[PDB]
């Protein structure tokens, strides 16, 4: 969670012009929000492994 808070949040919100828009969109609100873990769970069990298997 400390790694998420630094890497996924602070770097994303520090991006110029459209940095806090991506953070707001990805986290569904301010850190930590209530949708990060379910979204990460979906992306980690279905989306990204599905792309990896297709690429493999």
């Amino acid at each position: 969670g400390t790694g998420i808070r630094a890497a996924l949040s602070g770097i994303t919100m520090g991006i110029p012009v459209i940095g806090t828009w991506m953070h707001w969109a990805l986290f569904g609100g301010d850190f930590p929000g209530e949708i990060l873990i379910p979204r990460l769970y979906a992306l980690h069990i279905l989306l990204i492994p599905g792309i990896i298997l297709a690429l493999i």
Partner: peptide, 20 residues
């Protein structure tokens, strides 16, 4: 997915302000 970062939703002594 798109949300407005600066939408005033937080109550404050000087009117609604953004979360950040």
């Amino acid at each position: 997915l798109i949300k407005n970062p600066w939408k005033p939703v937080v109550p404050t002594a000087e009117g609604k302000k953004a979360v950040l």
